[PDB]
Amino acid sequence: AVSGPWSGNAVHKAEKYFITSAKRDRDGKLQIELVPASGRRKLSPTPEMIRRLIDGEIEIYILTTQPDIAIDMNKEIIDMENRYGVKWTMREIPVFYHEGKGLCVELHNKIYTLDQFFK
Amino acid sequence: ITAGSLFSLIALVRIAFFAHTSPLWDDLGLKKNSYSFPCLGPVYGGTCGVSIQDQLWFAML
Amino acid sequence: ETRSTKWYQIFDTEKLDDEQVVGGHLALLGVLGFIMGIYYISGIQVFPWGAPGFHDNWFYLTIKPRMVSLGIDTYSTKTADLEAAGARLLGWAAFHFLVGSVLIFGGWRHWTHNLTNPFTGRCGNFRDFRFLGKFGDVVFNGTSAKSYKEALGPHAVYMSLLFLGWGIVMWAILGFAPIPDFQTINSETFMSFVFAVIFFALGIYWWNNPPNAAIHLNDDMKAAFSVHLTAIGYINIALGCIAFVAFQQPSFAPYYKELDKLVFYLYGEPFNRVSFNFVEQGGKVISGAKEFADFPAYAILPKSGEAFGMARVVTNLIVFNHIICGVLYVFAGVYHGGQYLLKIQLNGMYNQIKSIWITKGRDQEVQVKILGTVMALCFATMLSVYAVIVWNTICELNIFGTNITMSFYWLKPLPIFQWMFADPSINDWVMAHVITAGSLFSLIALVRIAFFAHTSPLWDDLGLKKNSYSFPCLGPVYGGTCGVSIQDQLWFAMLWGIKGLSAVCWYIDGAWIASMMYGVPAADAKAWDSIAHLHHHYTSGIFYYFWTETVTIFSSSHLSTILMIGHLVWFISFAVWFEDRGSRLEGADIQTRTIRWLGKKFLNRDVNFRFPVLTISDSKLAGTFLYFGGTFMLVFLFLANGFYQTNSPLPPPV
Amino acid sequence: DAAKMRRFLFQRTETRSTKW
Amino acid sequence: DVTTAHSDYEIVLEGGSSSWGKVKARAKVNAPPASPLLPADCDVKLNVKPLDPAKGFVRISAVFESIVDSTKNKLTIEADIANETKERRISVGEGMVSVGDFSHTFSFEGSVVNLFYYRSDAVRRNVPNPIYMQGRQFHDILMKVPLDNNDLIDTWEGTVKAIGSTGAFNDWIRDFWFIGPAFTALNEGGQRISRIEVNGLNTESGPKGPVGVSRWRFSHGGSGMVDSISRWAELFPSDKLNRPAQVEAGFRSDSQGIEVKVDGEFPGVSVDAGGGLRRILNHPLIPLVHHGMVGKFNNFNVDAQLKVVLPKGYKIRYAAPQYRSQNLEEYRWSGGAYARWVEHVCKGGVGQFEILY
Amino acid sequence: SNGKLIALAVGGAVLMGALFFSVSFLTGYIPAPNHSAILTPLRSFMGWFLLIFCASIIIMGLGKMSSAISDKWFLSFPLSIFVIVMVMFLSLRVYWEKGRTTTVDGKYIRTTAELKEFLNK
Amino acid sequence: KAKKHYFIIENLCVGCGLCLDKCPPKVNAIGYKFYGDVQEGGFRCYI
Numbered sequence A: 001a002v003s004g005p006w007s008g009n010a011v012h013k014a015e016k017y018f019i020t021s022a023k024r025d026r027d028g029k030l031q032i033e034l035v036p037a038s039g040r041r042k043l044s045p046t047p048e049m050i051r052r053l054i055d056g057e058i059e060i061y062i063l064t065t066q067p068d069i070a071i072d073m074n075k076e077i078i079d080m081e082n083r084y085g086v087k088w089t090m091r092e093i094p095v096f097y098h099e100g101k102g103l104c105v106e107l108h109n110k111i112y113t114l115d116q117f118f119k
Numbered sequence B: 001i002t003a004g005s006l007f008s009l010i011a012l013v014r015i016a017f018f019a020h021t022s023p024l025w026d027d028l029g030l031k032k033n034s035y036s037f038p039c040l041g042p043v044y045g046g047t048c049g050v051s052i053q054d055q056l057w058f059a060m061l
Numbered sequence C: 001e002t003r004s005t006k007w008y009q010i011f012d013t014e015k016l017d018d019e020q021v022v023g024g025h026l027a028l029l030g031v032l033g034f035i036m037g038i039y040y041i042s043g044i045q046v047f048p049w050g051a052p053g054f055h056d057n058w059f060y061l062t063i064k065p066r067m068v069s070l071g072i073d074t075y076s077t078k079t080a081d082l083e084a085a086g087a088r089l090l091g092w093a094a095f096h097f098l099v100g101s102v103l104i105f106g107g108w109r110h111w112t113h114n115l116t117n118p119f120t121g122r123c124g125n126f127r128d129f130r131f132l133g134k135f136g137d138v139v140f141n142g143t144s145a146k147s148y149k150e151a152l153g154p155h156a157v158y159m160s161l162l163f164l165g166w167g168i169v170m171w172a173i174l175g176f177a178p179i180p181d182f183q184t185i186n187s188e189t190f191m192s193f194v195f196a197v198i199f200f201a202l203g204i205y206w207w208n209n210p211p212n213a214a215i216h217l218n219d220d221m222k223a224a225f226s227v228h229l230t231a232i233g234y235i236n237i238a239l240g241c242i243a244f245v246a247f248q249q250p251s252f253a254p255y256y257k258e259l260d261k262l263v264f265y266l267y268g269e270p271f272n273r274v275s276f277n278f279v280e281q282g283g284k285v286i287s288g289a290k291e292f293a294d295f296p297a298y299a300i301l302p303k304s305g306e307a308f309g310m311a312r313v314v315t316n317l318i319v320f321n322h323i324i325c326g327v328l329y330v331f332a333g334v335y336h337g338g339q340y341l342l343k344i345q346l347n348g349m350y351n352q353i354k355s356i357w358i359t360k361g362r363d364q365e366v367q368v369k370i371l372g373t374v375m376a377l378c379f380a381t382m383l384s385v386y387a388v389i390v391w392n393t394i395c396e397l398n399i400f401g402t403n404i405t406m407s408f409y410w411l412k413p414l415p416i417f418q419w420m421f422a423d424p425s426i427n428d429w430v431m432a433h434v435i436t437a438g439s440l441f442s443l444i445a446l447v448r449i450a451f452f453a454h455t456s457p458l459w460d461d462l463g464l465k466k467n468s469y470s471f472p473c474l475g476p477v478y479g480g481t482c483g484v485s486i487q488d489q490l491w492f493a494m495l496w497g498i499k500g501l502s503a504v505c506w507y508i509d510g511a512w513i514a515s516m517m518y519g520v521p522a523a524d525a526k527a528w529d530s531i532a533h534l535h536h537h538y539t540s541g542i543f544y545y546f547w548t549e550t551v552t553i554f555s556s557s558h559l560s561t562i563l564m565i566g567h568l569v570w571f572i573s574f575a576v577w578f579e580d581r582g583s584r585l586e587g588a589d590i591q592t593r594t595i596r597w598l599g600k601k602f603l604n605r606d607v608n609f610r611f612p613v614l615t616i617s618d619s620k621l622a623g624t625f626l627y628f629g630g631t632f633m634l635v636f637l638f639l640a641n642g643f644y645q646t647n648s649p650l651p652p653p654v
Numbered sequence D: 001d002a003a004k005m006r007r008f009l010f011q012r013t014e015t016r017s018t019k020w
Numbered sequence E: 001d002v003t004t005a006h007s008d009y010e011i012v013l014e015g016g017s018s019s020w021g022k023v024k025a026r027a028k029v030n031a032p033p034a035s036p037l038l039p040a041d042c043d044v045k046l047n048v049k050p051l052d053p054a055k056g057f058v059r060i061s062a063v064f065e066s067i068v069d070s071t072k073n074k075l076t077i078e079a080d081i082a083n084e085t086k087e088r089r090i091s092v093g094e095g096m097v098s099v100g101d102f103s104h105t106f107s108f109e110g111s112v113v114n115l116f117y118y119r120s121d122a123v124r125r126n127v128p129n130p131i132y133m134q135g136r137q138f139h140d141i142l143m144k145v146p147l148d149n150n151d152l153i154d155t156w157e158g159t160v161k162a163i164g165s166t167g168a169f170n171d172w173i174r175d176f177w178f179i180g181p182a183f184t185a186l187n188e189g190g191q192r193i194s195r196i197e198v199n200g201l202n203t204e205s206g207p208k209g210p211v212g213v214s215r216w217r218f219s220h221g222g223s224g225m226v227d228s229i230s231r232w233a234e235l236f237p238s239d240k241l242n243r244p245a246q247v248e249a250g251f252r253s254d255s256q257g258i259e260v261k262v263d264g265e266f267p268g269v270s271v272d273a274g275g276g277l278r279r280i281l282n283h284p285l286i287p288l289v290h291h292g293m294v295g296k297f298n299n300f301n302v303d304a305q306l307k308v309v310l311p312k313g314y315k316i317r318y319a320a321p322q323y324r325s326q327n328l329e330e331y332r333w334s335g336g337a338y339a340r341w342v343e344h345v346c347k348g349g350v351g352q353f354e355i356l357y
Numbered sequence F: 001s002n003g004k005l006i007a008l009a010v011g012g013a014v015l016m017g018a019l020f021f022s023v024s025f026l027t028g029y030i031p032a033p034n035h036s037a038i039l040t041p042l043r044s045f046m047g048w049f050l051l052i053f054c055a056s057i058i059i060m061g062l063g064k065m066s067s068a069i070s071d072k073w074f075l076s077f078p079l080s081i082f083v084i085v086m087v088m089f090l091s092l093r094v095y096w097e098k099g100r101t102t103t104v105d106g107k108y109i110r111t112t113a114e115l116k117e118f119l120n121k
Numbered sequence G: 001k002a003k004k005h006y007f008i009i010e011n012l013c014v015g016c017g018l019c020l021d022k023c024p025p026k027v028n029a030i031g032y033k034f035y036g037d038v039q040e041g042g043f044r045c046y047i
């Protein structure tokens, strides 16, 4: 099921990972590295670790201050804040698994793919 | 005395069991980093008197 | 934009128009007439048919000296003159029932915008009307007031009309001709016509020229309603002050002083008791032992008005009522007023208002200087007088090798002011300075609401704004920021006010204020009356007040129930005023889960309740209400237990 | 004078510190 | 004896990227239905299972069990809808239509194409939450029905004869298709039904008996009001369908009134609103515009309660009309402004009610 | 809030009453004069049961009307309060006490002097 | 050195401001940002 508050971080209900860099290779494939909230090891989104995401054992997120996020996140973030210190707001986007495309980010009612999303 | 013991025992069972986390703050996704922190602020209708030092006060009171 | 869908904000000025306001006011004066007609039925000492009347109630005692003054009620000891009185009170109770029903009808249709009368088959216009046909056409040039400023003239006229009507009523129905000498009730008819002339003339001067003062008050209903409440509260305080000096004047003796001579049977007072083995039969008591044997079993016993001191008890119950409210309405006028100053600072109309009632305090520079003068004067006065009371307490308790000779017995009001007190003494010098200190103390919380509704000299420093009026705090940041909104500053005005609101209760019950301990059997407590040549023996000292006044409370089975209930309500305010809101939120969660778990195991069906917890701002609300209601549910017991000051001082015990 | 004023409130805060 | 209607609503949402929400609705109304025949009762069931998430195919089912003026009426549908592209969506399904002692089955091979008259970047940039989207839809239909009854055989011929002898069959068929006040509804929602096109009407033998086979095409355009066109991507959360989703509802109607019971979970109840904020999906406009058609015949007083339950840690940033009461996680709407909005939208109004959590 | 939920409250009240009645037959307390052994416990339990029951209904009743009051209660709430106050004053003179204080002979005493004379003799 | 960087995750913040008081007062990096009623998480911190 789920581990207790005492095991790992207490705030987390499932283990938490953050995509920290999204550089590309010579062939243009997106090399995604995600480190856990503790942050002492580097992993890539392999099927075995995606398989955890199907059962909710882990959760993946992206910061909006990432150096290579490709999409102009600050302008859109600034607009929403103005709708309802505005600059320096930072958010965590919850990455989800789409069987057809793999990891997608439902940003502003529009599904995206990590390769489409990142530079 | 039986009622007066079980009343102040509630504040004591909470120091023993909710020093770092409680079922509510595991739900609200929060950590009690500290033993003498007053509140987390107005948030969630407010959360004052949640540390174990404050639960000690509510056992003395 | 903070939520305003709370049940206690349903009748807010934002949710009502000018037409609805009139309907709301009318929908209450009709209820008030229904209430006034019940305070009249209860006051029937003997029924018209000859059946015995109603036992004394405090709701009719505070109005009995007035109905006696107007002739509806009499103080006669004879049933024949007490059987007519009963018929009259029935007449005015039924009359107030009819007039109240009209005002409620004229409030229901006013509230629903449905101004149609069946007989005339024509609907009137709120925007413009002739006002009582030709009468209004001659005076208001055939038009109606178009704004609050233009309503002053017509509103003043209405006041003149009401005064003229009261004068006609006293002359024709009550038989009091207008003789202009100020020792008789007949002078209340003469001045009912002088006032009707002043107001009518004043009501025409304001209709031809509408007042330009506070022009912004026309724009918002709450802005004008709050200035009226800051004014009505001061008026009410003045009425309480005036009723204390007047109700015990020689000219008011036939109505207030006369109460002492009567025997009163209040409900819930000591009654003829009975033995455990009591078996009452119709004809006679059998195999039972009953106390007194002068009245029937379980019959309220008499009470000597003179021993009770009912003339001063009734004077106090009325004087304190119009002061407990007068200061509550001053506090609410500033609150509901600063509640409007938050909106003009949020939507930014503040810097463009030319009114000197908003322009004078525009700059923060003056604000700190004004608040720094209220704060400095409160310090130099709440200390100067507290150290006198503490020193007097030390000197008479012989603490630190001191005696009642070294106390402040030689300090009293100056000769210029001596006319203000029947008997001048340090008890009078202290009371004036306590009220002065007690006003400047709660004024600090009021100057804060007026000046710091949105931004303070500290928040402007900390880079923060106060977006709401009912925000509990900004978290634990900067060591803590709780109780910073104006609603909380209103609470700290009500809470701080309880001291001057108690220096009045104590001082009008004939207690000593110049010493915490007066009249106790200690070293110099009983040496006050002769060290200062007091012509009166004050009931007790600040602390010894609780012991003496409560001897009569414990003797009453109903005054003691109030004591219990009032204390129970008051300490419960601690639960919602202490910083344990986070603890309550967790606790409840355990209760919901615990109850869910108990229901689950115990019953096949699983039922959950999700126990609720109040918010801090919702906590400080129920907190002040439980603290204030509890604190003055019991102040009533001090006033209604009797007036036990005496005109004979005590010689030194030696 | 804001900074100097804030160094004080910071000198009396709700965070971990040494107390007498 | 006063037109009074009582209703209860409930939405429970999960946290994270989940768009899953539970919706329950009960209603009670005291005015007669605008139906020339009473009593008319009806139960509807819709179940969507994740047949193939890899390719993108789901198995949707629908059962209609309605008794109209003592006449049992049933319609059953089982179909396989999947996303082909952004504008095309093919469905393969079977169903059966029974009225009293009559019944006939059908099989269909169909595709729907949805195009927007324009797609501009400026509209997307300057309008954070667009409502009105002008578009058109095209249906390719291949109907196949086994004609094993005399009554079914007679309907099959007459149609061919009518096409053969009447030139205006493509036009006058719209009149027959939208029976009763259904045709009026077209103009009401700003929806235009184009003329049908018959590719072929050929009888093809089947193992059971002669089977009528039809292959037709049609189109219909929405001024923006229509939700099928304006919201084509949002009404099919196939990819968000990790677990089977079911919507169950039913209603009883007669001279005395209407009682409605609706319940079920499905994704798409919550959609991203920008700036990290989530929001309840914009109310469908077609149902409101379609109910104003029958809801304006009897004056009434509203008694509606809308209980909304949010995920742990999730608090409203803004709502108009504002919630009457807030029991922490669960917020409540009743009375005041909300009762004003319910009377608005029950009579055909489409005024916005926003919740941002 | 149906079936066993309300069934449970009735069962609990009956159990508490039986326990209070049962404990007495073994508590060994002398009964008051002209009182039944079975009645004393039954009367005491009913008073105890009423206090919690009255407190519980008042707590949920105030809660029910705190979130169900609006502009529509503008006239009804003030009229209902007046009606309760009125049915209350009538009870003072129709159930709590019948008439003003009178003596065995039926005479009245309305003056301090009349009282003083009564006290002495 | 400015090698490492620190951030507020705004959806997680509850605005308690414990972070703000650790920031040196002559370096007013952390600050407050209001958009609603505080009892409804209407305020957050940001560097």
Ligand code: BCL
Binding pocket: C007, C008, C009, C010, C011, C012, C013, C229, C328, C329, C330, C331, C332, C333, C335, C336, C339, C487, C621
């Ligand atoms: C008690 C200390 C304060 C006080 C503190 C508050 C607070 C706190 C609130 C109001 C609010 C209101 N106040 Mg105020 N108010 C006081 C004195 C008054 C007086 C007066 C008798 O002179 C009047 C006419 C008003 C008028 C009003 C309305 C403009 C508004 C909504 C009333 C409502 O729905 O009540 C509830 C309706 C009922 C039928 C319940 C019974 C109310 C009875 C009739 C008394 C009315 C006044 C009373 C204080 C209203 C609030 C009760 C709450 C439990 C605090 N206040 C004093 C000075 N007032 C609200 C608002 O929107 O302010 C901007 C609000 O949040």
Ligand code: BCL
Binding pocket: E046, E047, E048, E060, E062, E077, E079, E081, E088, E089, E090, E091, E093, E108, E109, E110, E111, E112, E139, E140, E141, E220, E228, E235, E236, E245, E246, E247, E265, E266
């Ligand atoms: C009502 C507005 C539009 C309409 C809207 C759509 C939409 C939208 C699409 C279809 C598509 C199709 N349409 Mg079409 N369609 C209309 C008119 C028609 C008519 C006709 C009798 O005139 C026909 C024969 C068809 C035929 C067809 C099919 C070929 C195909 C799949 C239908 C299906 O499986 O339904 C199943 C049978 C049912 C009874 C379902 C009824 C569902 C109702 C309308 C809504 C229920 C959902 C509820 C609000 C939320 C539930 C969530 C649960 C998880 C289910 N359309 C009108 C003009 N049509 C689909 C396609 O793209 O295929 C490739 C599709 O996505």
Ligand code: BCL
Binding pocket: C029, C030, C032, C033, C034, C036, C063, C066, C067, C092, C096, C097, C099, C100, C159, C162, C163, C166, C169, C192, C235
């Ligand atoms: C209006 C709502 C109720 C009502 C509620 C009350 C209340 C409340 C009281 C009475 C009381 C009385 N009522 Mg009644 N009464 C009503 C209708 C009537 C009518 C009638 C014409 O229908 C009559 C003849 C009476 C008769 C009487 C007398 C038996 C008695 C003493 C009146 C008095 O002193 O008046 C004097 C009246 C005036 C002089 C009119 C002028 C009042 C002015 C406008 C107020 C100024 C005060 C203050 C300084 C304001 C300053 C601000 C501005 C600068 C002006 N009532 C209706 C049904 N009645 C009183 C009582 O029983 O006392 C024991 C009492 O307190």
Ligand code: BCL
Binding pocket: C022, C026, C102, C103, C105, C106, C107, C109, C110, C114, C115, C116, C117, C120, C122, C123, C124, C125, C126, C129, C130, C131, C132, C133, C144, C158, C161, C162, C165
């Ligand atoms: C004590 C009575 C209450 C009151 C209770 C009623 C009642 C009762 C009725 C109305 C209704 C009406 N109200 Mg009103 N209303 C009050 C104050 C006002 C004021 C005001 C600001 O002074 C105005 C402009 C109005 C406006 C109006 C009329 C346009 C309307 C006409 C139909 C009718 O029968 O009319 C006759 C009246 C007029 C044509 C208007 C001119 C005469 C005056 C203004 C009428 C009110 C009574 C008068 C002031 C009482 C005597 C005052 C003395 C000092 C004792 N009311 C007075 C103070 N209102 C009617 C309604 O709602 O019907 C469904 C109605 O029958």
Ligand code: BCL
Binding pocket: C377, C378, C379, C380, C381, C382, C383, C384, C412, C413, C414, C415, C417, C428, C429, C430, C432, C433, C436
């Ligand atoms: C020896 C001076 C005493 C004193 C003795 C008297 C006497 C005697 C009388 C009053 C009376 C009054 N006093 Mg005093 N009063 C003092 C200080 C104050 C302060 C104050 C906070 O500073 C206030 C607001 C008041 C208020 C008042 C009014 C109720 C009334 C006004 C006339 C008056 O003072 O006439 C006489 C005034 C003077 C002779 C000089 C006043 C000097 C001013 C007030 C400066 C003294 C303040 C001082 C700095 C406080 C010390 C604080 C320290 C820094 C710790 N007093 C000091 C403590 N007061 C009269 C009254 O009716 O009493 C019932 C009265 O007869």
Ligand code: BCL
Binding pocket: E005, E006, E007, E027, E028, E029, E031, E032, E033, E034, E035, E040, E177, E178, E179, E182, E251, E253, E258, E260, E291, E294, E295, E296, E297, E298, E299, E300, E346
């Ligand atoms: C007086 C004001 C009353 C009121 C007055 C009435 C009256 C009067 C009536 C209703 C009716 C209805 N009301 Mg209403 N109603 C009120 C408030 C409510 C509330 C509420 C409080 O929330 C609810 C839940 C309802 C609910 C409802 C429904 C039970 C019913 C409409 C059914 C429907 O959707 O048919 C949906 C219909 C269709 C989809 C059309 C079917 C036929 C056409 C030809 C099909 C073409 C589409 C094409 C084939 C589709 C696609 C195919 C697939 C793509 C394959 N009402 C208010 C308070 N309401 C009406 C009703 O029908 O009652 C029985 C009615 O007469």
Ligand code: CLA
Binding pocket: B007, B010, B049, B058, B061, C568, C569, C571, C572, C574, C575, C576, C578, C580, C581, C583, C584, C585, C586, C587, C588, C591, F055
């Ligand atoms: C009579 C006063 C009183 C009562 C009944 C309670 C009761 C309670 N408190 Mg509170 N509290 C009080 C005073 C009181 N407190 C004061 C003065 C403070 C300030 C120091 C606090 C501070 C406080 C904190 C900080 C917390 C509570 C919590 C609790 C609850 C946990 C105990 C429990 O589950 O059952 C205890 C047993 C009972 C409640 C039995 C009922 C006792 C009687 C019969 C209740 C009915 C009498 C009542 C006064 C009637 C009112 C009449 C009206 C005229 C006033 C409980 C509901 C905790 C909680 O979980 O919050 C929800 C919590 O965290 N207490």
Ligand SMILES: CCCCCCCCCCCCCCCC(=O)OC[C@@H](CO[C@H]1O[C@@H](CO)[C@H](O)[C@@H](O)[C@@H]1O)OC(=O)CCCCCCCCCCCCCCC
Binding pocket: C237, C240, C241, C244, C245, C319, C323, C327, C420, C421, C422, C423, C424, C428, C431, C432, C433, C435, C436, C438, C439, C440, C442, C443, C497, C498, C500, C501, C504, C507, C508, C509, C510, C511, C536
């Ligand atoms: C809540 C927030 C703040 C608190 C203030 C609010 C309440 C104020 C409400 C006025 C309270 C008065 C009550 C009824 C009036 C009454 O009593 O008048 C008579 C007389 C004595 O009469 C006799 O009383 C006997 C009882 O023992 C005696 O034995 C006898 O010797 C004596 O003659 O009292 C004075 O002269 C009044 C003294 C106070 C003097 C007022 C001084 C204040 C003036 C200066 C400025 C103050 C304001 C500062 C700005 C805020």
Ligand SMILES: CCCCCCCCCCCCCCCC(=O)OC[C@H](COP(=O)(O)OC[C@@H](O)CO)OC(=O)CCCCCCCCCCCCCCC
Binding pocket: C569, C572, C575, C576, C584, C588, C591, C594, C595, C611, C612, C613, C614, C621, C622, C623, C625, C626, C629, C630
């Ligand atoms: C077998 C049990 C299994 C698990 C344990 C179950 C726990 C049972 C919980 C019972 C709750 C205890 C009952 C009271 C316990 C108690 O005393 O708690 C005091 C109460 C605390 O409420 P909280 O918000 O902390 O939450 C209480 C609930 O969570 C209780 O679970 O505070 C107030 O009510 C103040 C509001 C008063 C409103 C202001 C009115 C002002 C007017 C002045 C005069 C008014 C006179 C009368 C007014 C009413």
Ligand code: SF4
Binding pocket: B038, B039, B040, B041, B042, B046, B047, B048, B049, C472, C473, C474, C475, C476, C480, C481, C482, C483, C579, C580, C581, C616
């Ligand atoms: S306990 Fe209450 S007042 Fe104090 S910091 Fe926390 S929320 Fe603010």
Ligand SMILES: [Ca+2]
Binding pocket: C509, C549, C638, C639, C641, C642, C643, C644
């Ligand atoms: Ca006393």
